[PDB]
Amino acid sequence: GVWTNVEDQILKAAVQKYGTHQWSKVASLLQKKTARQSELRWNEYLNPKLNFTEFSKEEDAQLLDLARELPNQWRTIADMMARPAQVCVERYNRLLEEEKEMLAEARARLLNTQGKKATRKIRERMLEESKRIAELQKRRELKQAGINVAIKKPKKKYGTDIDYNEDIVYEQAPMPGIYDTSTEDRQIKKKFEQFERKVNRKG
Amino acid sequence: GISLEHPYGKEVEVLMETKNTQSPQTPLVEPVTE
């Protein structure tokens, strides 16, 4: 079963995300391929560490000697040559003489970073802000109509829940040092009340 | 010196203790008698 160029590119892009121990995830993209075949394709053709370059004269001597010292044991010979096995067997023989849709799914899956429930969570946040802006705009319309509705505070999930506007929730005042802070305290109070009047009238 | 027979050297006792030399019910502090 021939491997297409598009399938090879999908496999490389998938291994960039998933590594070399999650072949069932790789095969969920390659619709006509199994995980077993995908691991084979990587390990024997597409892994960049594989040395497919032409043999040196020393390598041809080494390969012929090993093929005498370890007869037919081509995975062992290959591991010693540090080259693919089918390369070593072919060398030994020489010396002795619609697919766009799958790619679209591939790009869509691999460029998705979020996962399922995080996507549902951002959707939920969108809906919550939609409902908040609904209340806000309705309150503004009714305010223009001259019927001043107050904004509804959130419901307490449990009996001891906190409204963080009513109090400075766990106030830890600065411990009083040697220097008198009074003048700048009343200045800060002036600043805060000025800001409050400003936001009341200017928004 | 130091050798494969005695990695720690001749002066050091090396023990390979696998087995309890007391019955498990033997007290470690003998009960008092008066």
């Binding site: 766990y170 830890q172 411990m175 040697i178 | -």
Partner: protein
């Protein structure tokens, strides 16, 4: 001495008050044989008795306030208010079929970490390797 051998020429306190050098310096370095005496038995037995009585009061409080009726087996009235009034303090017998502590509940509390005293920290003076 040495300079005389040569011939003559022919031609405010409040800043960081908790920190002091006396705390950084080890006391025993100028005197190795400084004694650091063990407490005598007169100290040991006194504080032992004090601590034992306190710990047994805590054991008694934990036991007596438990709901097990058997807990009392292992357990080992006047006030002056505003200087004028003499108060007779009683504690009437509770209905044994009602809860013993009416105000008691499981409730969480965040305790304030208030502290007036600042504690000094008293230290002294190739990144690719790490």
């Amino acid at each position: 001495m040495f300079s005389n051998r040569l011939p003559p020429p022919k031609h405010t306190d409040q800043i960081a008050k908790n920190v002091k050098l006396d705390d950084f310096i080890p006391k025993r370095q100028s005197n190795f044989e400084l004694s650091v005496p063990l407490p005598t038995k007169a100290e040991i037995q006194e504080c032992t008795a004090r601590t034992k009585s306190y710990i047994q009061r805590l054991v008694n409080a934990k036991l007596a306030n438990s709901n097990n009726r058997a807990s009392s087996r292992y357990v080992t009235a006047n006030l002056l208010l505003n200087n004028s009034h003499h108060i007779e303090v009683v504690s009437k017998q509770m209905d044994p079929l009602l809860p013993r502590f009416v105000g008691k509940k499981a409730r969480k509390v965040v305790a304030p970490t208030e502290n007036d005293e600042v504690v000094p920290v008293l230290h002294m003076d190739d990144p690719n390797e790490w």
